[PDB]
Amino acid sequence: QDGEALFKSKPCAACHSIDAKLVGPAFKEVAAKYAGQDGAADLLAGHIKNGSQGVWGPIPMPPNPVTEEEAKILAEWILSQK
């Protein structure tokens, strides 16, 4: 759950829904794509700070108040969302 925590303090929800979709890929659709995709959460974490674009919607995603460990955990949790 180390991901739910950060995701809770991080507005990642206002745009990333786990049961719905807003601006970014719904954590549920994101996990299904990068599910058990070890190594992917690491690449996604970079998109969190360096923003992401081209993996889902045409609109890129600005960086967030998160950090390295704050992005990785979110990456491993988003990919292993359970």
The response to whether 47 counts as a known ligand-binding position is no
CA 6 to CA 53: how far, in whole Å?
Answer: 22
Does position 73 interact with ligand HEC (CB under 6 A)? The reply is no
CA 75 to CA 30: how far, in whole Å?
Answer: 10
According to CB under 6 A, which one of 1, 5, 11, 32 is a site residue for ligand HEC?
A: 11
Number of H helices, E strands in the chain: 5, 0
**Pattern of binders to ligand HEC over 43-72, x per CB under 6 A?**
-x--xx---xxxxxx-xxx--x-x----x-
- Residue ranges at the known binding site for heme c: 12, 15-16, 61
